[PDB]
Amino acid sequence: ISYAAYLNVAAQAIRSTELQTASVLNRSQTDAFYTQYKNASEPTPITK
């Protein structure tokens, strides 16, 4: 866990009063997954 991960998670948890604009809400989520790779072949993606 990066510092910026930790604090990100803080930002996110708070989006669990919804008094804010739409870009703000977007920034705290993403659909992105990361394809893991071996040192060629690819181990299965785990959600980012």
């Binding site: 866990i1 990066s2 910026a4 991960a5 705290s28 659909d31 992105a32 790779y37 993606p45 980012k48």
Partner: protein, 265 residues
Amino acid sequence: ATLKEVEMRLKSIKNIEKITKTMKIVASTRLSKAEKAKISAKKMDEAEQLFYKNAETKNKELIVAITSDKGLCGSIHSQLAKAVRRHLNDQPNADIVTIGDKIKMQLLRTHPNNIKLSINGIGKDAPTFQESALIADKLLSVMKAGTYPKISIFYNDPVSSLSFEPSEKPIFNAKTIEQSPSFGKFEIDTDANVPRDLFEYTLANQMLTAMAQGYAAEISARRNAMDNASKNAGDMINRYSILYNRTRQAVITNELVDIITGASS
């Protein structure tokens, strides 16, 4: 025949122009979101940069590269790659993390080994804090980012919103904080592990900046590609149109030749 083979191929070029046209209009919309996002990112970054000068900028390596998952962006995919590969001469066994499907392809070929981590979801979801933060976290455990003395980022700088220049910068290592005066010029007692938090925070803030600047240089090159495609298709429309037309004139002439011979009969 001749006639019809001109005529169908011409349709292909015409459909292609329409597709490249539509796509370029759409590029212009994306470039604006890409720029707004870049400003805010770059400004956040600037505040750590004030610091890094005064600290003294100082000093296996890691390579990061920045692309969208979508293609048609001209030669961004491979020019950026070409600069990744040039610095692949300074160490063969360097671990390359490819951010976007398109840059992944060119680096995979030169060494399959160096692809260790790669990122899906750049094209659906624009550069934003969530991506960069999760990607900064995984770097530290998977890639041995922290225990590396070298980390460098490659991207495409959006010098202006109609241009792209490929550029590199360093992502200021925890080794850099340690051995630059900034436990001696910048104060903390022992109240926090300032290297292990500051590094991790500027891993992401710099990276976000590289992501937003790249998305903007790229989309800007893509508008250019899509424009240039539309022009190559236009040249081709005109040039095949003439080639068809002369054939019709030959056919009219042959019909008139039949009328001349038939008139003799």
